[PDB]
Structures are given as C-alpha cells and as structure tokens.
Design a protein around this ligand. Structure first.
Ligand SMILES: Nc1nc2c(c(=O)[nH]1)N[C@H]1C(S)=C(S)[C@@H](COP(=O)(O)OP(=O)(O)OC[C@H]3O[C@@H](n4cnc5c(=O)[nH]c(N)nc54)[C@H](O)[C@@H]3O)O[C@H]1N2
Ligand SMILES: Nc1nc2c(c(=O)[nH]1)N[C@H]1C(S)=C(S)[C@@H](COP(=O)(O)OP(=O)(O)OC[C@H]3O[C@@H](n4cnc5c(=O)[nH]c(N)nc54)[C@H](O)[C@@H]3O)O[C@H]1N2
Ligand SMILES: Oc1cc(O)c(O)cc1O
Ligand code: SF4
Ligand code: SF4
Ligand code: SF4
Ligand SMILES: [Ca+2]
Ligand SMILES: [Ca+2]
Ligand SMILES: [Mo+4]
Lengths: 875, 274
C-alpha cells in the first residue's frame, strides 16, 4: 500500500534505523551519520597518531536479530487466564504450572478480554487492600527492560505501582555484588555501588598505556553494557600501539580469543590467590608506589604483614597461589614484575568494575584485591589506573540528558536517581507531579529479590540492606525483617516479566513457590510466554519498544553509573518511533497502567491526561536538548548526535585522589559531608582502607561475619574445589557469565534467530539445547564427545545440555552462560531435570557472606555425565 | 565493466554473528522478487566456520565467515542448466523460479554454500544482497554482513579486476580452495590463522620466565622463522605447512633443540626448563 520509510528506534544493544513498509518492519540496521547534519566527532592525538571514531554506531547480536523477537510466535497473543483458577471458587494454587509439569504450558490457559482480565485483577487488588493493606501486594519487574526512558521500569512501572500498592521485591546489586558489599568499605564510591569513575581515561590510555590486565573482563561480549561494539576499534588502536593484553579468566573469553597476548585460567573462586601473590612479589621486590601508598592508604602496614605471612604463618608466594589456582607460579611472578615496571591499567570487569568474579563466593575479596593492586601501583597517576577500555571516551560531560535510572515520569527520589537533578527539571510543583511511595522505603516494607521464595514459603526472613544501598557505605548494614513491623505478609504477586528461573540462584525454589497456598493471586504482565509466565493466574500482554513511542540516549543509564554514555563513541539521542502497531492484542505498559488507573479511579492523577508521546515532549523539554533543537525539529529528525566539547579541561578518573587535591570530575560523589574540605575518598579516613573502618565498627558492634573480615585477606571461597566438602561429589568448577548472544533472557528462546547461532544453542533431534563447555580432558574421562547431550547436576537440580569440548578451560573447569529464557522441565516443575538450559538451577543460593546479602553464582560445583534420558524427578 | 569484491580479515573475526543475524533479518521474513524467496530457518548462507588450534594452555581459535564465493569461473552456472546465472558485475545468482524442484544444484558446489529450502522446494544461497546493491535508496551500498559488522572484518568494493589484482598482491589476500580454479571474488586476509598451524612454548631459566631468548625454526636445516621470547618466555611460530621442523633455543648461552611434527595440528612444547 506504500513505500519503505526509514525510522529510528533503539535497544539494549544500541540505536537502529528501522525500515518499515505497509505497517511491517523490513529490517533494522546500525546507524550511519550524515556529516551534513550531524556534528563532527572527537579526536585524540597520542603517540604520533590521530585517533577518531567511525562515523557510525554499532549493535549487539541480539539487536541485529531483534525483529524475530517482535514477531515471535511465543509472543503473548492476548490476555490469558489459568483454566483451573476460579476467583470466586476454587483457586487451585497447587495447579499453577501444571501444564509445565506435563510439558504443555499453553494448555493451562484460555483467552479472555482485556476488560475481563483487568476487572479480575482490580477485584483482587481492592479485596486485598481492604483486608490486609497495600503491603500484601508483592510486585517486582527485574533488572533489565526494553529500551526507552519514559516506559522504563524506573519510570512508568514505579509511577503506577506507587499509586496502587505495594511491597517491592527490591533488587540485590547483582551486577556489583563484590564491589557493593566489599569494595565499598575499602574505597567508598557508594553512589556507583562500589565501581570507580572512568572519566577521560581513553586519551590517558592511548598516550600512556603499555599493558592492560583484563581480569574477569570480556569487553567484546559485554561492551560494558548497552554499547554494542563501540569499544572494538579502541582496543585495536591500543594493540597497534604495541600495548600488551593479558587475560585472567577461567574461560578464554571472546575478547581474549581475539586479542590476547597471554591467558591465565584460574580455578573458580581462586582469583584472590593471584592478587595476593602479585602483591607479595611487589612487597618483596619493593616494586610499587610507596609514596602514593604512604599518603593514600590506611592499615597498609598491617595488611603487608598478612601478605608476607607474618601473622597467619603462610607467605602468599606465587607457588602458594599456583597450588590454589592452577596458574603457573612463574607466569604469575612474570606478570607481577611486568605490571610493576610498565604503565599498566587494570581492567577489572568489563565496565571498570563489575566482572563475573564479583558475584561469586570469593566476590568480596576479589573486588578488594583489585582495589589493592590498583592502589599499590598508584591509580590516578598518568599511565596507572583501573580502566577496562570500555569507558573514558572524551564526550561532552557538560551536556545534560537523563539516563533511564533518573526516574523518567515517576519522580521517585528514593527508588531512582531522580533526586540528583532530573526530578527538579521534570516537575514544577504546579502543573505536573511526581509519584512517591510511602511503602517502598526503609521504614516501610520490601523483601529481597533473592529470597522471594523463602518469604513466600516460609513467611519470615531477616537480612541486611535494602536493594541498591548506594546512599552511604553503611546503608547496606541496616537490618530489615519480613514481615516488616505492622505490615502484612504477601497475598498477591504482580510479576513484570518472568526471568528468575534462569537468572537467580538455585532457582528450582522459584518454581516451587508458585504453588504455595499463601499465594492467593498471581498476575504476570509480560511480553513473551516463557520462563515463569506459565505459573500465573492472569497474563497481560505487553509490547516491545518498537510498538510504542519513547525517547532515549545510546547506553545512557546514569544514576548508579553516572555518565555511562561514555561507553559509546558518540552521544546519540534518539526518538523511539512507534514503528508498527502492537502485535496481537498487546499494549504498552503505560497504556495497561492507564487502563488500570481508570478502573481504580486514579486516572487523572496517574496520566495527567497525557499519552506516551505527550510525556516524551515534557521529558524532552526537561533536558538540555532545547538548547539545540525544538521538540518538533527533533521529532522530525529522529536522532541527534551531541556535538564535541573540544575545549573542556580533562579530569582523569581518580587523578584528584592520587594527587591529594579537591575532587574535580563530574562524578556524583563523594558527598560533601563524606569529605574533609572536598578532598579524599568517601571513606572515614578519606583513604583506601585495607582494614575497613566501617566493617571494624560493624564487627565491634557484634555483627561477626567470618566471610567478610574488616581486613582484606585470603578467605577461602566457600564453594570452590579445594575448600568445599561438596567437591567430593561434584568435582567440576562451573562459572556461568552473561550470555554472548543475548541481553540476559532477551534474545534467547522465543523462536528467535539467535537460536541458530552455532555457539548459542545446539540442535539435537529437533530440540535446540543450551551449551556447556568442557575441557577435552574432563570430557574424555567421562566418555563425552562434542555435541553429546549431558546432564549437569548437584544437590540443587539437574540440567540437560549439549556438550562443547574445548581447550578454552583449565581441566576441571566447566562453563555455561546464565540467563536461559527457556524453562522446560522433563517432569514436575521445580522437581525435575530441565532441558531448557537454566544453569542457575545449579548455582548456590547461600549469600556471599552472613551480612553481605548478594548472589554468589559464579562459583558452583557440579558433576556432569552423558544423559541417560531420565527426567530425574528427585528435587 | 566494474565488478564487486569482498575482503574478509580472519584475524578480526570474533564470531559475534552480527552478519548471520543480518542475513536472516534481511531474508527470513522478506521475499525479494527476482532474487530469492524467504530464507529457511537453519540455513547458513553466511556460514561462520570455527576452528580451535593447539591444547590448553597455549591454544587459540579463529573464525572464517563464509558466504557465497561468487567465483568468476562458477561451477553452478556451468552445470546449472540455466538455473544459475552470472551477472556482469560478478554476482552469481540462482534463478528463484527456474531452480525450483532441483536439489541436484546443491552438488554443483565445491564450497557447499547452497541450502535446500523445504517449503519453497528450491536451492538457496548468498545473493550478496543484490537486491540492496541494485537499489540507490540503500545508502550503505554494501551487503548486510559488511554493514552489520562491528569488528571491521569486511572490506566491500566495486572496482576493476586490475585494481583488485593489485590489492591482492600488496595485502597477500588468498581464496579458499585455489586449486579448484573457480576464482572466488571473496578474498581472505590472514587466512593462515584458519588454514595453517603453529608451534609454541614457554622458556624458563632458573625457574623464571626468560625474556629475550633467541628462538629459531628450521625445516630441512634452513631457517624458516625466528623470534625472541616475550616476558612470559613465550614464542609462537604460526602459518606453518604440515611437515617436520626443528626448534633451536639459545638463552644466556644455554642451548636447547627439539623436533616437532605439524600434521594439521598446532603444537605446544610446554615449559622448556633451561
Ligand atoms: N550464574 C549467574 N547468574 C547471574 C549472573 C552471573 O554472572 N552468573 N549475572 C547476574 C546479573 S548482573 C543480572 S543483571 C541478572 C539478570 O537479571 P534480570 O532481571 O533477571 O533478567 P532479564 O533477562 O533482564 O529479565 C527482564 C525481564 O523483563 C521482561 N521485560 C523486558 N522489557 C519489558 C517491558 O517493556 N515490559 C514488560 N512487561 N516486561 C519486560 C523480559 O521479558 C524479562 O523476562 O542475572 C544475574 N544472575
Ligand atoms: N551480550 C551481552 N552483553 C551484556 C549482558 C548480557 O546479558 N549479554 N549483561 C550486561 C549486564 S547487566 C552487565 S551487569 C555486564 C556484565 O559485565 P561483566 O561482569 O564485566 O561480565 P565479565 O566481565 O565478562 O565477567 C567475568 C568474565 O570472567 C569470567 N569469570 C566468571 N567468574 C570469574 C571469576 O571468579 N574470576 C575470573 N577471573 N573470571 C571469572 C567469565 O568467563 C566472564 O567472561 O554485561 C552487560 N553486557
Ligand atoms: O544489571 C544492572 C545494570 C544496570 O545498568 C541497571 O540499571 C540494573 C542492574 O541490575
Ligand atoms: S559480524 Fe564481523 S566479527 Fe561478527 S561474526 Fe560476522 S565477520 Fe565476524
Ligand atoms: S561458491 Fe558455489 S554457489 Fe557460489 S558461485 Fe562458487 S560454485 Fe556457485
Ligand atoms: S552478502 Fe547478503 S546474502 Fe550474502 S551472506 Fe552477506 S548478508 Fe547474506
Ligand atoms: Ca606500573
Ligand atoms: Ca582469533
Ligand atoms: Mo547486571
């Protein structure tokens, strides 16, 4: 009926040009800049060369094949109701997931109208609120979400929920675990949940780098986050400058496979043995920055005595480290010596912080170990810092555009970073108003996402901290309980998405909780019929960001990752055009909430009479965009490339700290009250505390915690091959990092094109099985051959996988990405082997430490064998 | 009469599969009258070959994106009975209609790049997105592979045979299965990473990695390569054809030598303690 039109939109894998014709998406591609209307890029002159980025953006694999997700046959087609669920009769809680237990999920549901679905949910909401109160209504989306600032969970979800309930299952700082519960006590950075700032490090590195140690870092795979492959050319520049790349990772990751000069494969949970031996070498050879340490460290003398083995009787030698990790002593010492004499950047994690190693049983000591090494070598000075090569791009930090974490239309200052700046720009206290919550606050009631199963099935729990405790170093130490004083236990559960079986810990427990009799009602507001969705009583179809209007900036999260758009080669602001009408009978989350608001008699307050596009324009006017173009002009162009700011003075991450002067970067901390005269780290002493003062206070107050000592020491990982009794039955060490070809659950399954990728899933007898990588030696010992179906198991469950025999793992170590989107039990749900590929069924649910209430997934002991075909209904 | 050519740098492939996802995006749900029917899920018009070499801990892996070679002396055209034709710009295309019902076409390929589509009952394969190249509206003026790469692996060009020939010699570009004489127009840079092998090792002196040791590789008595060990005491001689070689090492006046057999496999001699 018409011609092809090129529109714009974006995703968690980067911005794209969307070609549409007759209401159908033809293709989605990376973006080409038009030098006639798009501002010039930045340039960096270093070591006799001029570096400038390509005039184009890049995308991730899962974004390249995203069209197959939009038009997926597993897309929820219309509102659905569980047949065995009668609101006014037998609710049959025990029959939730019955379809799944008989390998026929869809058979459990029947089609219903939007009007009837919403009436049923409203009747439940009102009944529960008047009988138990809003706290009885549990709700939680999950960590990630379709791209788009206005419709993002911190925005639309919170604006509505805050006006309706509710008890939030606040998220644990998954991405940051070790840095959050451990590193924070050592160097502060609470506002970044333990991660360091990275401002202007690219130019610093191009001019001074001689070596980069990628520790638990796979920049190519993770891109930091949301940045496609923007940093690929940068490591290419470094490589051509002669910079050496060393990788320390149990698995020879994708970046290592591409540019590694040397690769170390430590056994799971033993990285801190390597950091202690490196420090030991530096102390014995006097090869570190003593001046820097003398001025910027606290408790270093005592720590040094520990490293030297004076206090515990065990010198942390490279030989001692080899016996612990399996990495040759000579190589550890060689790296140590080279690191000391060359300008070396420590790329801990893919972002500059993070790293799979941080969310493992040794996560706390790994993070502190990374800080210790960077500190000893004088981080902040030219040629020495913590930099993962993904951030640090010289973008205009002075131009302001909100990341999704700043709240959008919710203005929630306690559960989003709206309070820093956006809330004040977006709301005027006259014509438009925020939606605060008096329940999702410390003095109200929330439960830990990691312990939802225990709260539902046990009816009681006690823990430390509330979600992301970034306010101050000690906020995570505050004690909470469920049910909270005066509040009600959960009666209803409103799920937004359903990825937990593949993303949390020892996940069979999440499947078991749905059938508990205390759960009177479960609603799932999702996009695809997968994961946990088939356990709900009512299912509401939401649409992707390609079916609604929104606005956003390439990789811009902001908030707990201030100015992270510096992950990209250009700051790109784009209008997310509604490319097509919603698929099936789905609708945007905002429209769903608008419909509920109407039935709850709060429509005016929630919507303020605005549709998604009206909110986008208001949002737009609250940014610095009006300085360059009007809404009308922006809407027409579709995207804007922020101009370069050539003359701004460079402020390299931590240089101010290294030089003992006032903080001068654009970072959001430390807060003035956490510093003396605007100098020093957020820590009490303002220095890097090898003996954390906050933890010393905590332990002296009576909170004894063996696995989180105030002093950074070699605490044996509780789930490692030589320190866990479990190793006898399950000798193999498994690490389960983020999926290479999917943004967590968003990409896998759904009959998407990504399932045809050779290294994603392997088709065997018509079924595409998840992959587990095994060293040829371990495979041979078990009669396992490439492509064979194997069973990975431990006390927590069984998972059927396709084996990939490789040399990319030290013998004894196995690897399998987490975040499988498919939950496909061979028997009863939560009690049998899964063939979908949910590796997190096997990971430990035990907290990193007694009070460090984070996930320790990446250290799991398992055993594998050729699958005999049984369903193993024994869990 | 300018022709199309593609250059693929093996040393730069990371196997993110942005290409592959790009074909599917372009062909799985779309039909292009005159060029091809929709692609069948599971087909690999763009087939990224994976190859691991060596053994832990001195192993490596390289990838080889493999589309249609659109060779100048194409066997399909020759034995396709008119169901396959060659355009002046070099693109080799299967006639979507004339090819229907002929599974035999698949066997006319020495490279095995065509796949049988069950629903359409026809052979299908790389079209080099001719439908896009033939449309001025497609601003990128290049195929979806090349455009979707985030790793600078592809170099897509339209030039004269002479210009391409010159480029081949300067960059040492190679094609797959040259001996067949089909003359691919898809060239590979650093192909040795995928087709050849290496020998490597780590030299230790008094227990520590030795940097600067002189290493020489000899075949039949004559030097074939040489290098000095890095700070990990390692060296790596790549691009080796199968056969027997001798490695000679000299560190601190201390010598060591040993033979190595390369048979479609790369070898790690391990730690050499001097
Ligand atoms: N073994 C192991 N486990 C790990 C980790 C690890 O390294 N190893 N990594 C950990 C980390 S960092 C994280 S961040 C978590 C991943 O944490 P996540 O919360 O678990 O997982 P996602 O796949 O992002 O799930 C988001 C859900 O929201 C739904 N959704 C997305 N957009 C929308 C929308 O617009 N509307 C609606 N209604 N629904 C939407 C999706 O379909 C999806 O199911 O995994 C953690 N688990
Ligand atoms: N394609 C894709 N990209 C993503 C995501 C995704 O799901 N898919 N997730 C996004 C999100 S939420 C985040 S938080 C970031 C995650 O970013 P990161 O946390 O940086 O992920 P990796 O750094 O690669 O973390 C560990 C790397 O080390 C290995 N590893 C695992 N455990 C250990 C250990 O104990 N020690 C050592 N030395 N190595 C270990 C793994 O093989 C892995 O490649 O990724 C972002 N990028
Ligand atoms: O995965 C993390 C990373 C982010 O950037 C975020 O906003 C929430 C998270 O749990
Ligand atoms: S897109 Fe580029 S790097 Fe990725 S697999 Fe294809 S050629 Fe390789
Ligand atoms: S690779 Fe095969 S299909 Fe392509 S032109 Fe050559 S012989 Fe024909
Ligand atoms: S040139 Fe076009 S048809 Fe050929 S592999 Fe690339 S994307 Fe596919
Ligand atoms: Ca140094
Ligand atoms: Ca490679
Ligand atoms: Mo995360």
């Amino acid at each position: 009926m018409g011609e092809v039109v090129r529109l714009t939109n974006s995703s968690t894998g980067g911005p794209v040009f969307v070609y549409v014709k007759d209401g159908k998406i033809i293709r989605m591609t990376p973006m080409d800049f038009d030098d006639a209307v798009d501002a010039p890029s930045w340039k960096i002159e270093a070591r006799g060369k001029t570096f400038t980025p390509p005039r184009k953006t890049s995308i991730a694999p899962y974004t390249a094949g995203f069209k197959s997700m939009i038009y997926s046959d597993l897309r929820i087609p219309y509102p659905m109701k569980r047949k065995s669920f009668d609101p006014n009769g037998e609710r049959n809680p025990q029959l939730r997931g019955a379809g799944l237990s008989k390998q026929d999920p869809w058979s459990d549901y029947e089609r219903i109208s939007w009007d009837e679905a919403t009436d049923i949910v409203v009747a439940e909401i009102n009944r529960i609120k008047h009988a138990y109160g809003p706290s009885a209504i549990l709700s939680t989306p999950s960590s990630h979400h379709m791209w788009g600032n206005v419709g993002y969970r911190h925005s639309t979800y919170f604006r509505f929920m805050n006006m309706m309930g509710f008890t939030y299952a606040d998220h644990n700082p998954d991405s940051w675990e070790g840095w959050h519960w451990g590193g924070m006590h050592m160097w502060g950075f609470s506002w970044r949940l333990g991660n360091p700032e990275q401002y202007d490090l690219l130019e610093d590195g191009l001019k001074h780098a001689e070596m980069i140690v990628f520790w638990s870092s796979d920049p190519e795979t993770n891109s930091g986050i949301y940045a496609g492959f923007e940093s690929n050319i940068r490591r290419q520049w470094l490589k051509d400058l002669g910079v050496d790349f060393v990788f320390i990772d149990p698995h020879m990751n994708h970046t290592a496979r591409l540019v590694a000069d040397k690769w170390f494969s430590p056994k799971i949970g033993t990285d801190h043995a390597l950091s202690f031996a490196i420090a030991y070498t530096w102390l014995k050879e006097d090869s570190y920055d003593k001046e820097y340490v003398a001025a910027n460290a606290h408790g270093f003398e005592e720590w040094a005595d520990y490293v030297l083995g004076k206090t515990d009787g065990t010198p942390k030698t490279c030989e001692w480290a080899e016996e612990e990790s399996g990495v040759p002593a000579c190589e550890i010492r060689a790296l140590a010596r080279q690191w000391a004499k060359k300008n070396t950047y420590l790329a801990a994690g893919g972002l500059g912080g993070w790293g799979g190693a941080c969310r493992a049983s040794h996560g706390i000591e790994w993070a502190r170990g990374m800080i210790a090494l960077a500190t000893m070598q004088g981080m902040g000075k030219p040629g020495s810092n913590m930099w993962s090569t993904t951030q640090g791009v010289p973008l205009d930090y002075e131009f302001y555009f909100p990341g999704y974490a700043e709240g959008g239309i919710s203005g929630d200052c306690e559960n989003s970073a709206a309070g820093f700046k956006f809330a004040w720009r977006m709301f005027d206290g006259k014509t438009t108003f925020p939606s605060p919550s008096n329940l999702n606050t410390s003095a109200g009631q929330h439960i830990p996402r990691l312990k939802i199963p225990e709260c539902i099935m046990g009816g009681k729990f006690q823990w430390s901290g509330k979600g992301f405790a970034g306010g101050d170093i000690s906020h995570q130490l505050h004690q909470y309980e469920y049910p909270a004083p005066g509040y009600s236990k959960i009666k209803m559960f409103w799920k937004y998405g359903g990825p937990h079986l593949g993303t949390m810990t020892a996940t069979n427990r999440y499947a078991k909780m749905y059938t508990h009799d205390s759960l009177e009602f479960v609603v799932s507001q999702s996009i695809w019929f997968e994961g946990e969705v088939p356990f709900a009583d009512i299912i509401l179809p939401a649409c992707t960001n390609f079916e609604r209007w929104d606005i956003s900036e390439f990789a811009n999260c902001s908030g707990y990752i201030p100015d992270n758009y510096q992950l990209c080669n250009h700051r790109v602001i784009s209008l997310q055009a509604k490319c097509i009408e919603p698929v099936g009978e789905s609708m945007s989350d905002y429209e769903i909430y608008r419909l509920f608001a109407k039935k709850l008699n709060i429509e005016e307050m929630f919507s303020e009479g605005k549709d998604e596009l009206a909110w986008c324009e208001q949002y737009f006017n609250a940014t610095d965009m009006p300085k360059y173009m009007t809404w009308d002009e922006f809407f027409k162009k579709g995207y804007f490339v922020v101009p370069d700011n050539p003359n701004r003075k460079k402020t390299v991450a931590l240089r101010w700290f290294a030089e003992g002067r006032e903080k001068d970067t654009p970072d959001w901390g430390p807060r003035l009250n956490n510093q003396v005269c605007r100098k020093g780290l957020q820590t009490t002493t303002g220095k890097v505390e090898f003996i954390a003062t906050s933890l010393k206070n905590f332990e002296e107050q009576g909170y004894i915690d063996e696995h989180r000592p105030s002093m950074h020491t070699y605490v044996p990982a509780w789930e490692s091959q030589k320190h866990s009794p479990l190793a006898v039955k399950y000798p193999l060490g498994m690490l389960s990092p983020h999926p290479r070809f999917s943004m967590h659950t968003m990409g896998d399954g759904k009959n998407s094109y990504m399932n045809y990728i050779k290294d994603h899933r392997v088709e065997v007898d018509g079924y595409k099985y998840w992959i587990m990588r095994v060293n040829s030696i371990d495979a041979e010992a078990r009669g396992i051959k490439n492509g064979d179906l194997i069973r990975a198991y431990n006390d927590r469950g069984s998972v059927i996988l396709a084996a990939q025999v490789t040399e990319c793992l030290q013998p004894g170590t196995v690897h399998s990405y987490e975040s499988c989107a498919v939950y496909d039990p061979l028997g009863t749900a939560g009690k049998s082997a899964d063939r979908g590929g949910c590796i997190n069924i096997l990971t430990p649910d035990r907290y990193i430490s007694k009070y460090a209430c984070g996930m320790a997934n990446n250290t799991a002991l398992v055993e594998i064998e050729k699958w005999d075909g049984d369903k193993y209904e024994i869990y | 009469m300018e022709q199309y050519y593609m250059v693929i740098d093996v040393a730069k492939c990371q196997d993110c599969n942005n290409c592959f996802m790009g074909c599917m995006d372009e062909h799985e749900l779309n039909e292009w009258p005159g060029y091809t029917a929709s692609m069948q899920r599971g087909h690999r018009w763009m087939n990224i070959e994976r190859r691991e070499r060596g053994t832990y801990p001195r192993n490596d892996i390289n990838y080889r994106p493999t589309p249609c070679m659109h060779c100048e002396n194409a066997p399909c055209v020759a034995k396709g009975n008119g169901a396959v034709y060659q355009r002046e710009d070099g693109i080799v295309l299967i006639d979507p209609e004339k090819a229907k019902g002929k599974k035999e076409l698949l066997d006319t390929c020495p490279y095995g790049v065509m796949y049988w589509n069950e629903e359409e009952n026809v052979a299908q394969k790389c079209t080099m997105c001719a439908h896009l190249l033939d449309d001025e509206s497609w601003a990128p003026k290049m195929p979806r592979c090349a455009h979707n790469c985030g790793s600078f692996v592809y170099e897509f060009l339209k030039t004269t045979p002479e210009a391409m020939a010159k480029k081949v010699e300067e960059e040492g570009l190679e094609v797959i299965k040259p001996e067949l004489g089909t003359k691919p127009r898809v060239y590979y840079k650093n192909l040795y990473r995928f087709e050849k092998n290496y020998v490597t090792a780590g030299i230790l002196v008094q227990g520590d990695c030795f940097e600067g040791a002189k290493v020489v590789l000899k075949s039949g008595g004559k030097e074939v390569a040489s290098a000095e060990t890095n700070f990990f005491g390692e060296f790596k001689f790549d691009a080796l054809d199968n056969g027997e070689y001798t490695v000679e090492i000299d560190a601190d006046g201390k010598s060591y030598s040993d033979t190595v057999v390369i048979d479609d496999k790369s070898v790690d001699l391990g730690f050499i303690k001097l």
